[PDB]
Design a protein around this ligand. Sequence first.
Ligand SMILES: CC(=O)N[C@@H]1[C@@H](O)[C@H](O[C@@H]2O[C@H](CO)[C@@H](O[C@@H]3O[C@H](CO)[C@@H](O[C@H]4O[C@H](CO)[C@@H](O)[C@H](O)[C@H]4NC(C)=O)[C@H](O)[C@H]3NC(C)=O)[C@H](O)[C@H]2NC(C)=O)[C@@H](CO)O[C@H]1O
Length: 410
Amino acid sequence: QKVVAGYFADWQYANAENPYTVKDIPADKLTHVIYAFLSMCGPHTGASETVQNLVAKQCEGKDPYTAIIVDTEAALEKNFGAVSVNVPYKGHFAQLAEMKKQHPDLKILPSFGGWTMSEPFHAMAKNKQAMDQFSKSAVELIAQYDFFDGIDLDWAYPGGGGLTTSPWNPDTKLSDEQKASEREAFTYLVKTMRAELDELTNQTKREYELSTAVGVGPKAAGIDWKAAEPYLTNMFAMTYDFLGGWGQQTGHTTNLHATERSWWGMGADVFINQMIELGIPSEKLVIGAAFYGRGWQGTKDFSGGLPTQDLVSEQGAQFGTGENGYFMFWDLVKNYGAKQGYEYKYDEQSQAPYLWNPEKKVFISYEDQRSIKAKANWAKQANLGGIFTWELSGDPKGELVEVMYQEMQK
Ligand SMILES: CC(=O)N[C@@H]1[C@@H](O)[C@H](O[C@@H]2O[C@H](CO)[C@@H](O[C@@H]3O[C@H](CO)[C@@H](O[C@H]4O[C@H](CO)[C@@H](O)[C@H](O)[C@H]4NC(C)=O)[C@H](O)[C@H]3NC(C)=O)[C@H](O)[C@H]2NC(C)=O)[C@@H](CO)O[C@H]1O
């Protein structure tokens, strides 16, 4: 029984072209659904205005660093349809409670953080009392919403490299002292959260999981894994976003294998191996698959061959499924295929698919059945814990999940 996990983005239902809800999740093919994202009462200056307003609203009457539902309309209020369970809310959470009823062996986790809401962790990590309050209140939150099976932490990232903590910019790069403080704080956080969950177990007699995302390369090495790992169930390795429309460097976003043609030698295999070397047990590690792609326009010096280690484009694509530069899998299948002038290609050495439009000079890197099969099989051979996807709505048919399930649970 390997992990076959999917993230469920709380916001995706709002796209009329793919209004994906909890009722669309292929629950019988997953071991875990992870609800993205919750946060805490702390600074969100780097998030959208929408998110900052939602947070400020929820902060009313709560202590600093209290675990919160952010989009409460999505989570609790919007009617996604009647359910058999008698719960005093609607939203996605009523649907998750129903899903748990119909699929009792599925594990459902809330994820705290994510790219745009990691910022408050940096403030929380400065004080033990802040971390205690977040731990206490996060466990109270799942105790109240008792279809949840534990807690996932998606703090991008202790030691920096996230949205408000870029090392490439002088005034956001974290100091050595702050990196060190955050290293110790992450251990304390997971120790405290694990203890709080163990107390909940003593009350309810259920087992709870505590898991975390892990960034790649230097972003993994900001945590003391030898100290932290005993507290954690799974580490979800974010083996994606290697390249993107933020830079002119063009190539694979989530390639399984590093090659001599990779930009900067990147590939999921090399990053997973580093994580194991840092002291994450392979059997706790879960490789990441993407149900989206990224793309570039005005790709230079390229005729449709294999991508190389110096491939560049004018810029990231000024087009996307919603925000520019990324594409959900379903949008790629519908709108960026052969009939639209995009040639599907597969880099066998990398195990990664890409799309090349020769007339328009557009390059897209993504993930498909072939690469997911390859990643699941590699995970098995590397004695990993399983595979997960960011995020389920990219695959409305459930066809990519089916590959994850069949190939991992094999
Ligand atoms: C730990 C870590 O770094 N995890 C990574 C993921 O965070 C990351 O995926 C990105 O996650 C962002 C949130 O952290 C996503 O931001 C969402 O962006 C959409 C626009 O795409 C916003 O949109 C809807 O939101 C409200 C709520 O219903 C709705 O009313 C609005 O009309 C609608 N907005 C628009 C313009 O459509 C969301 O509010 C926002 N969410 C948050 C919490 O800020 C971002 O989309 C997502 N990027 C992806 C999927 O490519 C993944 C992938 O990079 O990597 C993990 O490592």
